[PDB]
């Protein structure tokens, strides 16, 4: 199943909900111990990790350096070592059982730093920084390379993407996207990096484009039904799901699913409540 953790509707949320694309049901589990939005979700060793984000509440607006681990059989959260810095609107990828925490903001500081967590030592350590400061950055791993895609540097929203090589600790700019995208959903479906939606500084986007490594080319595919930024995104059974987000007026509950063979989007699900800025992952 695909778990969504955190999110935001009037305040940051502690929801942990699981969607069944087979039954179409929603299964609700333990609350996050601290509410979080603008966080990222991943899975390592079947354990679900929630990374960074922020607690935007009626009494505060605290950027999170926290990393928290959910175990699907135990149904319980456990704190892990926290990152060097708080990272709101962070991006994360998984390579060789390690957690990469990418960019994000703390206050008005927009990070270019990246750090790496290893679950069996419970430690973070900094690696080479990106060439660009990026919050709202989409992150993906393909051929066990780490891609940071789009985002916002504090001033400009970005269509650039860069690649991190683990065995040299270096970042390389790649071909930029056709569209400037901050707060897009970025994943690796089959073997292209997919960037769906986001915000270009004036409009939320429903366009989706994908990066083909062999040709270093971005190509437009089926555009999403409903424009959305700050969306959750994951791949289930070889097809992509995008959950929630913001369209400039309302917090979406819509969940869309992309079939890569037909190249078609349409509405699969409502979340139990509309929200943006969730962390999504599958186990």
């Amino acid at each position: 199943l695909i778990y969504t953790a955190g999110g935001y509707f009037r305040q940051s949320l502690s929801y942990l909900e699981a969607y069944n694309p087979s039954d179409g049901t929603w299964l609700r589990l333990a609350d996050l111990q601290v509410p979080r939005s603008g966080l990222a979700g991943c899975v390592v060793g079947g354990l679900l990790y929630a990374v960074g984000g922020r607690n935007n509440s009626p009494d505060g607006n605290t950027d999170s350096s926290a990393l928290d681990c959910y175990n699907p059989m135990t149904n319980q959260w456990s704190p892990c070592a926290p990152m060097s810095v708080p990272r709101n609107r962070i991006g994360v990828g998984v390579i060789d059982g390690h957690i990469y925490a990418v960019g994000g903001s703390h206050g008005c500081i927009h990070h270019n730093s990246v750090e790496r967590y290893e679950p069996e030592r419970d430690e973070w350590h900094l690696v080479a920084p990106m060439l660009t400061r990026r919050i709202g950055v989409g992150v993906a791993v393909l051929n066990r390379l780490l891609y940071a895609v789009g985002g916002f540097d504090g001033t400009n929203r970005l269509n650039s993407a860069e690649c991190y090589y683990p065995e040299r600790n270096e970042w390389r700019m790649i071909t930029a996207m056709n569209t400037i995208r901050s707060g897009a959903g970025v994943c690796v479906l089959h073997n292209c990096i997919y960037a769906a939606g986001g915000y270009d500084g004036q409009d939320q986007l429903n366009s989706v484009e994908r990066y083909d490594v062999a040709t270093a080319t971005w190509t437009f595919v089926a555009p999403m039904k409903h424009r959305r930024s700050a969306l959750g995104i994951t791949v289930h059974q070889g097809r992509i799901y995008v959950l929630g987000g913001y369209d400039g007026h309302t917090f979406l509950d819509s969940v869309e699913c992309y079939d890569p063979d037909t190249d078609t989007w349409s509405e699969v699900t409502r979340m139990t409540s509309g929200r943006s800025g969730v962390g999504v992952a599958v186990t």
Partner: peptide, 9 residues
């Protein structure tokens, strides 16, 4: 509201 995330300021 944040134009991108919807979150309050």
């Amino acid at each position: 509201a944040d134009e991108e995330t919807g979150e309050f300021a």
